[PDB]
Amino acid sequence: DYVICEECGKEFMDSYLMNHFDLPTCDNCRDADDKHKLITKTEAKQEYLLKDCDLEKREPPLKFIVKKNPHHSQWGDMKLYLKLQIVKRSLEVWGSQEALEEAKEVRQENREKMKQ
Amino acid sequence: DYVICEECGKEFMDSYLMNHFDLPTCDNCRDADDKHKLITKTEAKQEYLLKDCDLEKREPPLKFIVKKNPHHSQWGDMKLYLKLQIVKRSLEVWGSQEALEEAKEVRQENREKMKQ
DNA sequence: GCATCTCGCCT
DNA sequence: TGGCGAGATGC
Ligand SMILES: [Zn+2]
Ligand SMILES: [Zn+2]
């Protein structure tokens, strides 16, 4: 029930980041424009090389906010994840900073060879 | 812990179908060649128009056995599901037999028109 | 932007 | 008597 903000170390029980994601970060220590900045599913997946199974099966499975696309209401709603959890999930799916670069570098190697 | 086999209506607690799938059917009532017959994920999906999420996300999420492809060890393992559960998961996702048939007919319309 | 849909290899 | 990648378009 009652929880320790990772950040300020204070107790809290109810946070926007603890309701919507299970992130022990009290709303005072929330950074909705910086560390607590969101990302679309797609950018996430292309910017960190993350299978939907890496998001949704891997434990704990990350959660997201639905939003309406801008003046694009005829299209499907955006799945906004917290960028912070993607960063870490990635780090734990790739195991390193270096391995993400290396694999995307190897990824480009094929993309050019796929079409070459 | 204890359960009622849907089929004979007797109490049981342990079953091959109740351990592997959550199917209240005692191993006496078990038809592993017919009603308790299994199908690979691919045929399941292509025979009954199911998305991976219709299998995995839709509560209750269906489970499966892993098996070794015939002399095809070089490849990815088979996920055998139970055919029954898919026949139902399908029915609920498509609502009716009339709505499976229709939708695969409307499917073939576009497959043709996709190439035309 | 995202969730489908076929495809060339089993990293 | 099979499943996983990965590229280009509705939505
Ligand atoms: Zn705090
Ligand atoms: Zn029974």
Side-chain angles (χ1 to χ4, degrees):
Chain A
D1 210 28
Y2 263 88
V3 178
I4 302 293
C5 174
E6 269 182 350
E7 281 291 308
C8 55
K10 199 73 96 167
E11 283 171 0
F12 72 105
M13 185 172 76
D14 184 275
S15 179
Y16 165 92
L17 298 173
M18 178 52 104
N19 305 311
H20 293 298
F21 320 93
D22 283 35
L23 170 69
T25 302
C26 80
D27 287 287
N28 297 342
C29 305
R30 178 192 183 187
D31 214 333
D33 274 314
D34 201 48
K35 183 178 179 180
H36 297 105
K37 183 169 71 172
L38 305 175
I39 61 171
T40 65
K41 182 184 278 193
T42 44
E43 157 187 8
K45 283 173 54 172
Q46 293 185 135
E47 278 304 298
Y48 302 96
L49 292 170
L50 213 57
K51 298 178 325 177
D52 299 90
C53 73
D54 300 350
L55 296 159
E56 302 170 329
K57 195 58 198 182
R58 310 269 167 152
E59 312 302 0
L62 270 45
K63 299 296 183 181
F64 55 66
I65 303 174
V66 177
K67 205 180 184 145
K68 69 184 177 288
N69 215 6
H71 262 266
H72 272 287
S73 303
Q74 266 173 319
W75 307 357
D77 270 17
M78 299 165 93
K79 287 152 185 199
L80 294 189
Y81 294 68
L82 201 59
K83 198 184 186 147
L84 197 81
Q85 291 174 340
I86 305 300
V87 168
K88 181 58 176 171
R89 180 51 50 83
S90 161
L91 260 177
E92 288 322 332
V93 167
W94 291 121
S96 295
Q97 263 204 291
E98 312 160 329
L100 168 56
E101 293 177 350
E102 183 178 2
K104 191 160 281 290
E105 183 178 2
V106 174
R107 175 183 181 258
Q108 294 300 320
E109 263 177 57
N110 296 41
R111 286 227 53 167
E112 295 302 320
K113 179 52 166 77
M114 296 297 103
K115 300 186 72 66
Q116 161 200 348
Chain B
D1 266 19
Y2 268 85
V3 179
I4 309 289
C5 172
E6 269 166 327
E7 278 278 342
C8 63
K10 192 83 91 168
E11 282 216 335
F12 74 101
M13 178 188 84
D14 183 61
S15 171
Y16 175 103
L17 302 171
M18 186 48 110
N19 290 323
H20 305 290
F21 322 97
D22 295 324
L23 175 64
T25 298
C26 82
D27 287 295
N28 289 346
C29 310
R30 179 195 177 187
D31 214 334
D33 284 313
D34 196 43
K35 205 184 162 149
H36 301 288
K37 187 205 294 274
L38 275 66
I39 47 162
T40 72
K41 184 200 271 190
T42 59
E43 167 184 21
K45 282 174 50 186
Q46 292 192 136
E47 284 308 297
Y48 303 97
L49 291 171
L50 295 174
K51 308 179 313 187
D52 277 297
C53 74
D54 298 349
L55 295 162
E56 299 169 343
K57 196 61 203 181
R58 311 257 167 157
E59 312 298 340
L62 295 174
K63 207 71 58 151
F64 55 70
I65 293 169
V66 175
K67 199 181 185 151
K68 69 185 176 292
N69 226 331
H71 260 261
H72 281 306
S73 295
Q74 270 164 317
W75 307 359
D77 277 356
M78 299 165 87
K79 295 144 181 204
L80 305 181
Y81 293 68
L82 195 64
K83 204 178 174 157
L84 200 68
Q85 283 178 342
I86 310 284
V87 159
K88 183 58 172 179
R89 184 46 56 91
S90 178
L91 268 182
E92 283 322 281
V93 167
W94 295 106
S96 50
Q97 292 181 283
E98 63 185 342
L100 171 51
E101 298 145 306
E102 74 167 354
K104 188 159 287 291
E105 197 146 3
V106 172
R107 183 164 177 274
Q108 212 53 46
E109 263 179 40
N110 283 28
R111 298 306 298 281
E112 302 313 332
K113 179 52 165 77
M114 296 297 103
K115 300 185 73 67
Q116 173 186 4

